[PDB]
């Protein structure tokens, strides 16, 4: 919330779900996701940062958060 | 596990063509307190040194010569616990096989059994071979006697040999002094001298253990008896 | 030593339509000269328009029945699909062929309806074996009742002038009449009579009581 004050925000932000999903992060790495979410946001053309940008951002490697799909038929 | 572990052995062929673990056991042997053997032909003498290192002891408690049978005896150089265990299994095998039959034990057959147990452990893993070398001493009739058994699994006949610390040096002394006809009393004098030459920390009637195979096989010497020989020639 | 064979069987009668079947049974169960119980049938509804009856000994009868029921449940789990009558017919036999070493036995019969819009009844021997029926009486009193049953219901012997085709109603009258008659000729028949009537609507039960003395 403190870091996001510089950043342009759409009005709802649902930090609690995000905070929980995030795991084993140091103080810099959480900050890292935020700036990054703004970079993702830049690619969209979106002028306001929204929930979805963050979700992609944490999923990215920086404490070995990763995902893969295919383990279903 | 309970059947998992190392199926193949610690010992392994080398591009040397030597067996590493085997090499180490000659070292393991090396550390042993001084041992000798003299074959008096009609008799046999085996002797060794009890080092002593704690004044706190009792009796003459554990030995380093134990009777397998009433006719053959073992003495060794290498690791003591291994020795106790080695004697137990063999001792069990000697009695069982030669009470099926009523014939008394042939020497070679004991050697064949000790070597196999040593060899199976070389073949298999999980367990390591024993790191002892034995002198199999017996008497029976007019047969040859005094035999040596390696941690290697090999056997040889000898007239005389030596073990323990500085084995090569003692054997060279032994080689020169030991010749022709001798007596059972005479063989004892020599063995004490050869042990003294290897090292004397001291010799008392409790640094020495001497046993012979002569009248009706293995007989254990009294402490006084040996002491008579020490005076007979120091 | 102790027995490896005890009798307990009753008497039953299975009658096959061509779109219905009825399987009827006494409730009286006896062995010899002492009476085990004055109640209980050996005919049961397995379900889905399959009716089954196991005559021979009560101890065996409950056990087979329970056991079959799981094989049917398991089968449906294994992929949706059910045993037909015929399937069940093979399944009982394998069990029996195993039991040929076991010293207790039973005389089993299965009845139900096909999807050919008619009855099938298959009857087994107490060693294994199967045969196609038209009509079967099973149990003790069977041997005496059956030639007459065969003739009155059937008209398929070489000793009758005519045929008539079955009717349900008519089958019910004949069945009661045979049982009421059976009773003063046995001490294995009596008390009450339990009728399982099998139709394509569903399974109905009727009970009527009989004489005793």
């Amino acid at each position: 919330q403190i870091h996001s004050r510089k950043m342009n925000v759409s009005p709802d932000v649902n930090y609690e779900e995000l905070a929980r999903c995030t795991d084993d992060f140091n103080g810099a790495q959480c900050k890292a996701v935020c700036v990054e979410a703004g970079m993702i946001a830049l690619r969209r053309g979106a002028t306001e940062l929204t929930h979805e940008d963050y979700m992609e951002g944490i999923l990215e490697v920086q404490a070995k958060k990763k995902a893969n799909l295919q383990y279903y038929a | 596990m309970a059947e998992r572990g190392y199926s193949f052995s610690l010992t392994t062929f080398s591009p040397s063509g030597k067996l590493v673990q085997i090499e180490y056991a000659l070292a393991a042997v090396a550390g042993g307190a001084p041992s000798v053997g003299i074959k008096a032909a009609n008799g046999v003498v085996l002797a060794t040194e009890k080092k002593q290192k704690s004044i706190l002891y009792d009796e003459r408690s554990v030995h380093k010569v134990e009777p397998i049978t009433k006719h053959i005896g073992l003495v060794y150089s290498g690791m003591g616990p291994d020795y106790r265990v080695l004697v137990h299994r063999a001792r069990k095998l000697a009695q069982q096989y030669y009470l099926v039959y009523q014939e008394p034990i042939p020497t070679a057959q004991l050697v064949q059994r000790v070597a196999s147990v040593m060899q199976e452990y070389t073949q298999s893993g999980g367990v390591r071979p024993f790191g002892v070398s034995l002198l199999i001493c017996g008497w029976n009739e007019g047969r040859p006697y005094l035999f040596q058994s390696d941690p290697s699994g090999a056997y040889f006949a000898w007239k005389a040999t030596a073990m323990g610390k500085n084995y090569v040096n003692g054997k060279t002394f032994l080689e020169k002094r030991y010749n022709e006809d001798l007596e059972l009393e005479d063989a004892i004098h020599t063995a004490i001298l050869t042990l003294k030459e290897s090292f004397e920390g001291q010799m008392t009637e409790d640094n020495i253990e001497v046993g012979i195979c002569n009248e009706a096989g293995f007989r254990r010497l009294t402490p006084t008896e040996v002491k008579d020989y020490l005076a007979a020639i120091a | 030593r102790f027995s490896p064979y005890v009798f307990n069987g009753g008497t039953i009668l299975a009658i096959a339509g061509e779109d219905f079947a009825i399987v009827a049974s006494d409730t009286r169960l006896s062995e010899g000269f002492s009476i085990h119980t004055r109640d209980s049938p050996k005919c049961y509804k397995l379900t889905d328009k399959t009716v089954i009856g196991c005559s021979g000994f009560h101890g065996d009868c409950l056990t087979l029945t329970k056991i079959i029921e799981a094989r049917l449940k398991m089968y449906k789990h294994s992929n949706n699909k059910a045993m037909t009558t015929g399937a069940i017919a093979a399944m009982l036999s394998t069990i029996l062929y195993s039991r040929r070493f076991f010293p207790y036995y039973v005389y089993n019969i299965i009845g139900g309806l096909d999807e050919e819009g008619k009855g099938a009844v298959y009857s087994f021997d107490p060693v294994g074996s199967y045969q196609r029926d038209s009509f079967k009486a099973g149990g003790s009193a069977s041997a005496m009742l059956q030639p007459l049953l065969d003739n009155q219901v059937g008209f398929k012997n070489m000793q009758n002038v005519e045929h008539v085709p079955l009717s349900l109603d008519r089958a019910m009258r004949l069945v009661k009449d045979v049982f009421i008659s059976a009773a003063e000729r046995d001490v294995y028949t009596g008390d009450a009579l339990r009728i399982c009537i099998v139709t394509k609507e569903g399974i109905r039960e009727e009970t009527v009581s009989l004489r005793k003395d």
Binding site: Y71 | - | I67, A70
Partner: protein
């Protein structure tokens, strides 16, 4: 480093005492399909998404009829699940033969757990990487349990598995009080909504993927499949 070390030991213990194997197992649950579980505690429903790999296929089932009073949804790989399911059916069969009782699903679930846990407690066994939402209608009502391949057994009044589980959880907590001990219809609507939360939400609702399964006071195991959910939509 030592990532390979921690795979190589199934007896693993680290300075922080973590067991990575469990961790891996959790990522595998998140890889699976989307499933929700809901109960009023007089009816229980589960909306489950059944998906298809490509256009010319048709969806694979993830709702399994374990018994005619108990059932599950699977979320994770199909192959392991089949193996577990035979053991549990046979455990139900002997209950019926010997005892002639259904047996508490609570009691059942606990037993299955042990037999898995003990092989993690020694050499061999990789994680099974399927999580389950297990439903059943027992003597004291329906009950809902989450079985994990961490053998973490918990009874919940509703739960969810699938990536973005948390989303739907938060809605379930919000609507939680509305669920009460009635209405069939209401539970399903909330489920359809909730299920939308689990998905990326760019994918629009479809009747071929969804599947609705109910068990309740006089109900046993029934599945609504394809089009059949439209009546109740």
């Amino acid at each position: 480093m030592f990532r390979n070390q921690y795979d190589n030991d199934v007896t693993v213990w680290s300075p922080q005492g973590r067991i990575h194997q469990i961790e891996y197992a959790m990522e595998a649950v998140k890889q699976g399909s989307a499933t929700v579980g809901l109960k009023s505690k007089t009816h229980a429903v589960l909306v489950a998404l059944k998906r298809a790999q490509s256009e010319l296929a048709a969806h694979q089932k993830k709702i399994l009829h374990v018994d005619n009073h108990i059932g599950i949804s699977i979320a994770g790989l199909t192959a392991d699940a089949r193996l577990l399911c035979n053991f549990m059916r046979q455990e139900c069969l002997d209950s019926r033969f010997v005892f002639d009782r259904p047996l508490p699903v609570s009691r059942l679930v606990s037993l299955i757990g042990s037999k898995t846990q003990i092989p993690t407690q020694r050499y061999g066994r990789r994680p099974y990487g399927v999580g389950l939402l297990i439903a059943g209608y027992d003597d004291m009502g329906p009950h809902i349990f989450q079985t994990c391949p961490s053998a973490n057994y918990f009874d919940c009044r509703a739960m969810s598995i699938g990536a973005r589980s948390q989303s739907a959880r938060t809605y379930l907590e919000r609507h939680m009080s509305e669920f009460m001990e009635c209405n069939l219809n209401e539970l399903v609507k909330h489920g359809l909504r909730a299920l939308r939360e689990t998905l990326p939400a760019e994918q629009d609702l479809t009747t071929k993927n969804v599947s609705i399964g109910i068990v309740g006071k006089d109900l046993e195991f029934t599945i609504y499949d394809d089009d059949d959910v439209s009546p109740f939509l």
